[model samples]
Target chain A: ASKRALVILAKGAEEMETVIPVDVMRRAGIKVTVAGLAGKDPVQCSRDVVICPDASLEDAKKEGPYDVVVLPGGNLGAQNLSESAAVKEILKEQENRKGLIAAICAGPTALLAHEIGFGSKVTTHPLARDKMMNGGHYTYSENRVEKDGLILTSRGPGTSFEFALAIVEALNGKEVAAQVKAPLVLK
Target chain B: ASKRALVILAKGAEEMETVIPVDVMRRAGIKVTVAGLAGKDPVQCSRDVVICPDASLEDAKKEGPYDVVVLPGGNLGAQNLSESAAVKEILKEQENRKGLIAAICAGPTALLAHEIGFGSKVTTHPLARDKMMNGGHYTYSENRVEKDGLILTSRGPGTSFEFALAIVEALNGKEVAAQVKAPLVLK
Candidate 1:
């Protein structure tokens, strides 16, 4: 059976972090569904760039049992994500089940705000690091891609590649990630 | 007078990093010219994603001076950029003149390999932090952006906003950068 990943979407999300993973994961043969917090209308990113979500978080809860839950960060993105009751419920259930619950940049901050990152090692956008530092062991990395248990977190925009690569490795296996890495010849 | 930014394009470049800056800069009223390094054919990013360049590196150098030199980071993208004699020459010239030279992810490794970052404080993809540190004086941050003198660097794709915002500030002014940031409510 094919595995599905749920990527939460909302206003003020970072464009590249969200899109790059969606593209790469899809390329790697993973099923990615962008679940919007709002209606079917395209959600706005930090720069007013519009992104079309594949489904609604409301619909995603009904539809899944997803393998992983992803949160992409921006200033207000984390807050908006945390505000979604369905997303919060999914995250809480995922944590209880010890399933994959990931966040990046301000996205991790949202996780913390939502009480999802308790006692985890994670990173986020520098400005929001103070808040992310709470209730967790924080390790600073420009790369931002780190996995501690089922909780995955990355720094900010710059860490998107590592973030995506780490997830790709986790979901599809390192061999597949290595194959993708090999073609790109990533250093 | 309008300022010009150089986007070094090569096969397997991170599509989002290269394209987002170009898209954002154009929206900010900056003139961007994509210069191909390997061949004249359109560069393919991901599967079936082909992008045309405005000129080759040789053509870009011969064309005249540009205000800023920007590099988008990917596996082969940085390698292709560092191998370009024309690009190295322009970077050398830019360094001597204190012109703005920006890179993200593995892009900074190109600067280090080219010896442009000998005494500069810089950052790169997290996995590359060790190499970057060995190559130069560096201050690491998980911040979305970092600027040291005329050189601006970000971590990776997630840092695109701060990276683009920094470029706007360097080439234009804080006013224009603010205008861009205000929408995202970013400082």
Candidate 2:
């Protein structure tokens, strides 16, 4: 059976940026495993929105590999995510293994911290573009969504629909994603 | 049978405030009906995100003399919502019937137009308190969440959790709300 992607969530994750995609993807029949960095059941988001995680990083790492790894960006949560050595290790493993990793808003910033942007073009929150420019090639798009290589990135909560739609396209094939988008009226 | 409150959404509904409450409420096993003022398809929260509505106001009003009505705030969405006859009618019915009505951020401002606050003390988005005084007595509370009579209100995205949890309490009773809060670790 085809498996779903892994979404890394932790305290201070932007609520809409994290949730809209999850809900939209699930409604499209894509399996989502919400993994908490803390390896706990519930992880808090911006403004203390408590969300239940499906698995922990330890468990996910032990599970070997996933199709994609996603990071939702809230500066504080992204800060914590970037600080996790385990996440850095996982990104390295995924990179070495030729897997896809996507981040949105401040998420790509977190990836940049681990040198994930060494040779790649990435996008991040507009406010953080100065930092992203310091690391890798930056292509500016007013478009809410942008994708490059194995990395997908988006702007802020405003772009969740496009961001999620892109993920669905990447993971389930564009056809499935289009089918979901058709009903959802999402571009 | 208990039903989740109907959250009427319009274009520019604050992305976090609208989506977070719905997600939280549903995870608590409370049914949520998302009603869109902009037809029955996906409604944009701001410029980038498009949210799909389960029903349209025309379809929903028929099914509701609902237990409660929830309106999440955004400047444009609130302005549009307050201007819509369908929304005004539904709110008027709820008010006269003593049904629960909850608003967050600019949401409570909708109540003012209807003169629902006549001689009643209600809390609104922090910045709107001065305007709120135009209708009735208003108080400022760093306490983002506030309950006045059957009208429940909150500040903004910062208060989305407390606002949603409060709805859970109103819809499913305090016991179930307690269970939802326990896992989320709300104070």
Q: For model 2, how does the per-residue alpha-carbon lDDT over A136-164 read when each residue is reduced to its tens digit?
A: 45655545677778878887655667788
Task: Give the CAPRI class of candidate 1.
Answer: incorrect
DockQ leader: 1
Kindly list the per-residue Cα lDDT of model 1 for residues A1-187, writing each as its tens digit.
7767888888888766677677667667778888888865667676554555777778877885777888988777778886777777889988886778878778887676667756666667777777777545455544447788898888765566677878888888988777665433233
**TM-score, prediction 1:** 0.57
TM-score of chain B of each: 0.90, 0.90
Give me the iRMSD of candidate 2, please: 12.8
- On the 0 to 100 scale, the lDDT of residue A45 in model 1 is 74
The reply for model 1, stretches above 4 Å from the true place, is A134-143, A185-187, B1-19, B22-187
The runs of at least 3 residues in candidate 2 whose Cα sits more than 4 Å from the true structure, single-residue gaps closed, are A136-142, B1-68, B71-94, B97-187
DockQ of 2: 0.06
How high is the lDDT of residue A94 in model 1?
87
Instruction: Name the weakest run of 10 consecutive residues (lDDT summed) in model 2 chain A.
Output: A178-187
